[PDB]
Amino acid sequence: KSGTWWDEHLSEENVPFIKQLVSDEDKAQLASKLCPLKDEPWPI
Amino acid sequence: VKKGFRAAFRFQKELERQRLLRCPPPPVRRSEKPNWDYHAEIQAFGHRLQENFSLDLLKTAFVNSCYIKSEEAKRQQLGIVLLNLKSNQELSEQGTSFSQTCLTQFLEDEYPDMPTEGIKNLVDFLTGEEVVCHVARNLAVEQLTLSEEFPVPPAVLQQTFFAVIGALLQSSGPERTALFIRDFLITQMTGKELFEMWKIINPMGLLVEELKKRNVSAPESRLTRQSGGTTALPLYFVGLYCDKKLIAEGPGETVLVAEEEAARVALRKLYGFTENRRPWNYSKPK
Amino acid sequence: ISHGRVFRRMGLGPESRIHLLRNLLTGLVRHERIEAPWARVDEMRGYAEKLIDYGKLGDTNERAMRMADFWLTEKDLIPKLFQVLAPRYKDQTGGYTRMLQIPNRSLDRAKMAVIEYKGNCLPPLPLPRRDSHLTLLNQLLQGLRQDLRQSQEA
Amino acid sequence: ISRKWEKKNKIVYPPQLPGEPRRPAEIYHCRRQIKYSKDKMWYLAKLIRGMSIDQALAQLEFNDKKGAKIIKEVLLEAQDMAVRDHNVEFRSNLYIAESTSGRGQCLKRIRYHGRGRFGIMEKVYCHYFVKLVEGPPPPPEPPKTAVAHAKEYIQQLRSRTIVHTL
Amino acid sequence: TARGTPSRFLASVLHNGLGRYVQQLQRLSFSVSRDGASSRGAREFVEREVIDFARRNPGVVIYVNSRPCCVPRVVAEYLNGAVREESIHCKSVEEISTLVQKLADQSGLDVIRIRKPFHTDNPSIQGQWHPFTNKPTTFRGLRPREVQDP
Amino acid sequence: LVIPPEKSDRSIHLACTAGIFDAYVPPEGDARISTERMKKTMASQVSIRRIKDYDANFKIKDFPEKAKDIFIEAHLCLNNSDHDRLHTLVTEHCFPDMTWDIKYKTVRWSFVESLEPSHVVQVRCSSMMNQGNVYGQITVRMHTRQTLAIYDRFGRLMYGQEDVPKDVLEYVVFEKQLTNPYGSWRMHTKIVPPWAPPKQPILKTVMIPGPQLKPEEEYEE
Amino acid sequence: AAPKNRRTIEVNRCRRRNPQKLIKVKNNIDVCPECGHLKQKHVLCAYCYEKVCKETAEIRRQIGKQEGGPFKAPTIETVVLYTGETPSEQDQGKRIIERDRKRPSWFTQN
Amino acid sequence: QLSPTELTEMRNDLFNKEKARQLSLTPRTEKIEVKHVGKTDPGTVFVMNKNISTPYSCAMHLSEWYCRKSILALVDGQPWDMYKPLTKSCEIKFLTFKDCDPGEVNKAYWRSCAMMMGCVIERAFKDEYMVNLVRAPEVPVISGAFCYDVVLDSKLDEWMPTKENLRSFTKDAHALIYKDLPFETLEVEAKVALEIFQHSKYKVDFIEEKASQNPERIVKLHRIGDFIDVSEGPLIPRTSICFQYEVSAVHNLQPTQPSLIRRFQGVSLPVHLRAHFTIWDKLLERSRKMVTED
Ligand SMILES: [Zn+2]
């Protein structure tokens, strides 16, 4: 019933790892959308 | 400090009423309270009911086995036979048997179309604890009842009530007692519906069997009326048709509920327990 | 409106604010750990960090000596700044102080903080520690890390 | 003055029968003539009302009001009083059944105003009352749901008769 | 006022009068004083009236108690369990006779507002009105603007 | 105040002593049996004479029967809280011990049987005219079966069982005020042997709190 | 401006007992693992902090006696040494403050 | 043989009967002295009732914080369930998820999550198909998922659960969590356990192995609601401890020739260590990979 935040229970070792992991996923997801016309675009 | 006594006395009376209201005293038998003469009360009981009871039989009807066994225990505890007191068991059995046969005759004669199961359920309701206890309490039977425990247990009160009927049967005979049962038990059906007293399940199943006994085609359910079908407050009238002839119609908030009610309506008509049936005749027999 | 106003209004005005902060900073240099209202410690913490940088310039830099002379009201502390505190942080580029909130002050329920210069000789504060790496969540993440490192090398 | 709250810990119930269920223990305690306002104390007695003994002590330990340190002191000595005197097995198996404040006996003083005028200030005092009951805190009542609202509305539509007729 | 007091529906005790009439008054308890001007009218009621009143009502047990009292009272008890106490302080013999007769005729139900001056368990013989009572039926029970056999 | 006002002619009239004049230590292994003998007997005989001095018609043989009656009736007062009658049956030293802990409790006690006849183990008298008062203490040995079921303030069983009899070996000491014309024999105290078996366990679990340490303090083994 | 009419207790209860006026339940309270006393997540444990302060004050009182006057801050580092301990290699050239007690378990020599 | 509903009723009666017997074997209310050896509340002694009072009762003497945070007990150096009756005078410590070394607590929570999966799997399939519980393999927590080996009916030899089906198992698991059922423990002799699990061949073989390991051939039984299983060690107090719980993947173990053992897999976190939505998703992905116990 007590509120929590993302790194509350993370150890010293895991906080940098989690930051890097989520950061890379964001960048990869943004790079995957850079070719809209090769990914079944709607009619122009 | 003000002079006088009247106001102080009046306030004391009020303080005692509130104290009693805050802590209502545990109830006690009327006999234990002041202004009680058992012999006088017994005689008034018969006179109120316009019945010529035999005072010896009537007194025994009130005596219960529990009161006799407890009275003897108190005698043993005090180191004190003269307690050859006859219980109401024999009178109770006689009265119970007469009432069931007498009520069965009243109900069979009036409603010849009800099967035996229905009449039995009606007699069980009329002679049941709840109905009998209500009548007994409102006829001063509980005040005159000699019991070990107060308030009188419902089973004990029911036994005493039928013992009084047994006393009347010996004193006045079957015809006089039959009027007593008519005037205090049959009247308890006033306003009651058939299926309020006779608790049944699957009315449609019962209806189909009855129509088979009567060599009538099975009833076909049809929607006579409908309103608010798609809303949270629908109304449905389901009609039961035998050979494309309407036998009964019932309302409901769902088609299933409406159909079950229509079956109950058909059963009430078949058995002669319609709301608008001829009222019970309480007039003096000719 | 106070958009971008980085300094607090303290004491009896601008001068008194500096004097109030200076007394706090002087106490910190002597004792190396003090407790004071949270807001005031937060305000003073910036000056306590910069004072060390001036101390690192050395006692021969006349500007540094003038800065230390103003901010340290007890002159015996000026040698300590240049010869004790600044050499202690020779190998750091910042983060000389640690500030932690302590239970509210009893009298007026003021929010309170403890501030100290790192590396002092005093009994260590009960610092907050992150959960052990051996906890259930941390072990599940260690497995995920091990797995991701193995797949990259392949 | 009335001191009925202290006499409620002297009620001796008759021994229970073998079939009867375990009766929870009730512990009454209070503190008189507290130099504090009953209106300000009411907000603290309302806070822990219904809480467990250990939850109430945690909420009062980090409250900044002056009454908090007093109620917590009254709870700590009522907890010990329960296990020591009222035959309570576990000291944590207690919850706040009743907790309210009351007006105490107050003193009147002069408050000087300008132009030779004055007011009368009351030096306020209050009482604090608490009742502890053995067992876990009763589960909070769930909020009324749509099924209950509809079930109640339809029940009112079914209870309506034809008025002012036969 | 009605809003400031309770109410009840008109009713009877055990359907009284349907099969037979049973007097609901069951007991009367008088408390007169041998000496005392307040009970003068109550003493004269016990000398000539109470005996003739009991002959007519054999189902009511009357308990006359002569004892020192400043306010003489009659306590009436009914079969349904109701108890009613009425002071006869300083009342004349005729006044007491009227009061005692009224008690004999009452059922014992609470003397409070009666919502309706009538009661019935069978208000309808022909069927209680409902919205379809006077509505005609249509072929195949079709609703307004409903396409059949589409 | 410990002592009433000073320089007052009136003083407190005490009817009892606080302790046993010469505590009777029962021989070890007496539960099994369930020159010095003469020396103790002679001291008892001496003391018995000063008991028979003030009250001529005293019989040691009758006392153990009387002692049992006093004991049973005193304990029966606890069941109904008949304190007024209890003061006649027990001394002021005994009364607080018996009743203080049961003020808000229900005690159901009963006497079942006496396994062994009661034996006057020791009879002794106080030093003459302590304050003008002479007391006589008669220790008695009782081996009897009793049933005890104490309840708490809420009627919940707290100790013992209400139907199971258990054996009790207890040496009850009685005391009388011989000088007082209205002195009587009254339960004074109970001697608890060190070897006595431990009492039956209580129903509820208990926690014994450890040392409450201030922040400066540290815990030591 | 003065009140035109007395405010009823009904109105006053609505104002006084509005959820905005009530004390809010705190969800950030936890047990201190070191001492077992309660603490808030973002605030130091009061029990542990007081313990540290009490030892800090004793050391400061000893520092006072060694300095023996105002304006006598040393120009060298300081070490606290407890009964049964001797200066380490890295404690040479530092003012030694000696405490007449055993090293607290939570005070790790560094 | 017995129907599934009847089999549970039989096993529960045997379990209850054995529980009642062990309770009778205590003379009235004997007392034991349990000394607290934890870092906090040092020196507290609990005078408890032998064979009735559990570690949870000792926590109740201290405070509610102990009851909420204490997941396992250390009784004379041995991990001890919070609801397991204490049998002797001993020393007691309380273990939480957030201890510096919570290895034992992790295993206890790790084993209980597997036992909750077994309960849902046994009660999920239609009565047509036969589910045979095998064992809960002991896999390290770092593996990323807990697993439970099951053998399904021959009819379901080409069936692999769908995503909606995996979600259905998860919803049943969460219903078990919502019920907040205590983990009841019973240490019985091999004979008693063999009678309860006579109908199941795998349990009999498993029961025999555990009895052989211990000189006294006493096997540890646990029950949640009406589901009884054999365990490797102490379990957590209640099912409400679990907060995030999902059945992730079902793998078919090899070799498949003798019998097709299906390894059901899940991952869960307690209330005390609940993870953020984003982090939880990453754990679910690794949980879906097959774990090979070493
Ligand atoms: Zn701490």
PDB file of C-alpha atoms in Angstrom, chain B residues 30 34-38 40-41 43-45 47-51 134-140 143 176 179-180 182-184 187-191 224-227 235 237 275-276 282, chain E residues 13-15 18-27 29-30 58-61 63 65 67 77-81 121-126 130-138 141 143:
ATOM      1  CA  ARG B  30     -48.301 -12.411  33.999  1.00  0.00           C
ATOM      2  CA  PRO B  34     -49.842  -8.449  40.811  1.00  0.00           C
ATOM      3  CA  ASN B  35     -53.603  -8.789  40.372  1.00  0.00           C
ATOM      4  CA  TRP B  36     -53.714 -12.438  39.306  1.00  0.00           C
ATOM      5  CA  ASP B  37     -56.247 -15.089  40.341  1.00  0.00           C
ATOM      6  CA  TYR B  38     -55.716 -18.264  38.327  1.00  0.00           C
ATOM      7  CA  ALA B  40     -60.900 -16.471  37.992  1.00  0.00           C
ATOM      8  CA  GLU B  41     -58.712 -16.191  34.889  1.00  0.00           C
ATOM      9  CA  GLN B  43     -63.325 -19.010  34.065  1.00  0.00           C
ATOM     10  CA  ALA B  44     -63.035 -15.751  32.117  1.00  0.00           C
ATOM     11  CA  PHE B  45     -61.113 -17.550  29.365  1.00  0.00           C
ATOM     12  CA  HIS B  47     -66.608 -16.993  28.928  1.00  0.00           C
ATOM     13  CA  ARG B  48     -64.755 -14.709  26.504  1.00  0.00           C
ATOM     14  CA  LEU B  49     -64.882 -17.471  23.880  1.00  0.00           C
ATOM     15  CA  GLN B  50     -68.576 -18.189  24.602  1.00  0.00           C
ATOM     16  CA  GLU B  51     -67.723 -21.823  25.336  1.00  0.00           C
ATOM     17  CA  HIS B 134     -50.144 -16.111  17.023  1.00  0.00           C
ATOM     18  CA  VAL B 135     -53.718 -17.187  17.780  1.00  0.00           C
ATOM     19  CA  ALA B 136     -52.766 -18.669  21.154  1.00  0.00           C
ATOM     20  CA  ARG B 137     -50.935 -15.538  22.314  1.00  0.00           C
ATOM     21  CA  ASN B 138     -53.882 -13.309  21.361  1.00  0.00           C
ATOM     22  CA  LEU B 139     -56.397 -15.559  23.168  1.00  0.00           C
ATOM     23  CA  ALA B 140     -54.645 -15.417  26.580  1.00  0.00           C
ATOM     24  CA  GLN B 143     -50.922 -16.290  30.227  1.00  0.00           C
ATOM     25  CA  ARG B 176     -69.290 -27.034  18.806  1.00  0.00           C
ATOM     26  CA  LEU B 179     -67.226 -23.820  14.914  1.00  0.00           C
ATOM     27  CA  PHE B 180     -64.278 -22.941  17.160  1.00  0.00           C
ATOM     28  CA  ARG B 182     -63.657 -22.292  11.843  1.00  0.00           C
ATOM     29  CA  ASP B 183     -63.668 -19.032  13.812  1.00  0.00           C
ATOM     30  CA  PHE B 184     -60.020 -18.987  14.964  1.00  0.00           C
ATOM     31  CA  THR B 187     -60.044 -17.161   9.475  1.00  0.00           C
ATOM     32  CA  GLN B 188     -56.231 -17.107   9.304  1.00  0.00           C
ATOM     33  CA  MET B 189     -56.535 -17.685   5.539  1.00  0.00           C
ATOM     34  CA  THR B 190     -58.124 -14.245   5.114  1.00  0.00           C
ATOM     35  CA  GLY B 191     -56.167 -12.335   2.489  1.00  0.00           C
ATOM     36  CA  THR B 224     -49.329 -11.548 -25.163  1.00  0.00           C
ATOM     37  CA  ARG B 225     -47.854  -8.153 -24.217  1.00  0.00           C
ATOM     38  CA  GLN B 226     -44.413  -6.579 -24.025  1.00  0.00           C
ATOM     39  CA  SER B 227     -42.956  -3.216 -23.025  1.00  0.00           C
ATOM     40  CA  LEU B 235     -42.819  -5.780 -18.634  1.00  0.00           C
ATOM     41  CA  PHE B 237     -47.296 -10.811 -20.158  1.00  0.00           C
ATOM     42  CA  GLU B 275     -58.497 -14.067  -5.733  1.00  0.00           C
ATOM     43  CA  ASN B 276     -62.137 -13.421  -6.696  1.00  0.00           C
ATOM     44  CA  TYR B 282     -69.177 -17.874   8.290  1.00  0.00           C
TER      45      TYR B 282
ATOM     46  CA  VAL E  13     -57.174  -8.495  16.480  1.00  0.00           C
ATOM     47  CA  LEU E  14     -57.342 -12.048  15.092  1.00  0.00           C
ATOM     48  CA  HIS E  15     -59.934 -10.990  12.508  1.00  0.00           C
ATOM     49  CA  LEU E  18     -65.478 -12.374  11.217  1.00  0.00           C
ATOM     50  CA  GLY E  19     -66.468 -15.735  12.685  1.00  0.00           C
ATOM     51  CA  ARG E  20     -67.374 -14.549  16.170  1.00  0.00           C
ATOM     52  CA  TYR E  21     -66.904 -11.435  18.285  1.00  0.00           C
ATOM     53  CA  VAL E  22     -64.533 -11.755  21.250  1.00  0.00           C
ATOM     54  CA  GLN E  23     -64.277  -8.908  23.747  1.00  0.00           C
ATOM     55  CA  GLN E  24     -60.673  -7.715  23.790  1.00  0.00           C
ATOM     56  CA  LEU E  25     -60.760  -6.252  27.305  1.00  0.00           C
ATOM     57  CA  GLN E  26     -59.354  -9.007  29.511  1.00  0.00           C
ATOM     58  CA  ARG E  27     -58.659  -7.484  32.936  1.00  0.00           C
ATOM     59  CA  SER E  29     -57.485  -3.373  38.062  1.00  0.00           C
ATOM     60  CA  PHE E  30     -58.962  -0.667  40.300  1.00  0.00           C
ATOM     61  CA  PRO E  58     -68.144 -12.296  32.483  1.00  0.00           C
ATOM     62  CA  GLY E  59     -64.982 -12.437  30.355  1.00  0.00           C
ATOM     63  CA  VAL E  60     -63.350  -9.487  32.148  1.00  0.00           C
ATOM     64  CA  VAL E  61     -61.698 -10.244  35.492  1.00  0.00           C
ATOM     65  CA  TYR E  63     -59.488  -6.711  40.550  1.00  0.00           C
ATOM     66  CA  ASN E  65     -57.711  -3.131  45.479  1.00  0.00           C
ATOM     67  CA  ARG E  67     -55.230   0.762  49.648  1.00  0.00           C
ATOM     68  CA  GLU E  77     -55.310  -4.998  29.872  1.00  0.00           C
ATOM     69  CA  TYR E  78     -56.264  -6.432  26.484  1.00  0.00           C
ATOM     70  CA  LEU E  79     -55.824  -9.806  24.815  1.00  0.00           C
ATOM     71  CA  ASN E  80     -53.278  -8.438  22.328  1.00  0.00           C
ATOM     72  CA  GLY E  81     -51.074  -7.521  25.308  1.00  0.00           C
ATOM     73  CA  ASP E 121     -57.532  -7.630   1.776  1.00  0.00           C
ATOM     74  CA  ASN E 122     -59.460  -8.099  -1.507  1.00  0.00           C
ATOM     75  CA  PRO E 123     -59.718  -4.619  -3.046  1.00  0.00           C
ATOM     76  CA  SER E 124     -60.311  -5.945  -6.580  1.00  0.00           C
ATOM     77  CA  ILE E 125     -62.742  -8.578  -7.859  1.00  0.00           C
ATOM     78  CA  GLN E 126     -62.410  -7.828 -11.582  1.00  0.00           C
ATOM     79  CA  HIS E 130     -52.602  -2.117 -15.287  1.00  0.00           C
ATOM     80  CA  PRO E 131     -51.461  -0.154 -18.373  1.00  0.00           C
ATOM     81  CA  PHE E 132     -52.629  -2.885 -20.784  1.00  0.00           C
ATOM     82  CA  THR E 133     -56.100  -3.265 -19.228  1.00  0.00           C
ATOM     83  CA  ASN E 134     -57.766  -1.019 -21.828  1.00  0.00           C
ATOM     84  CA  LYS E 135     -55.286  -1.427 -24.684  1.00  0.00           C
ATOM     85  CA  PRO E 136     -56.356  -3.436 -27.759  1.00  0.00           C
ATOM     86  CA  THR E 137     -54.215  -6.239 -29.150  1.00  0.00           C
ATOM     87  CA  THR E 138     -52.896  -6.328 -32.716  1.00  0.00           C
ATOM     88  CA  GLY E 141     -48.495  -8.685 -31.567  1.00  0.00           C
ATOM     89  CA  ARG E 143     -45.160  -3.230 -32.411  1.00  0.00           C
TER      90      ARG E 143
END
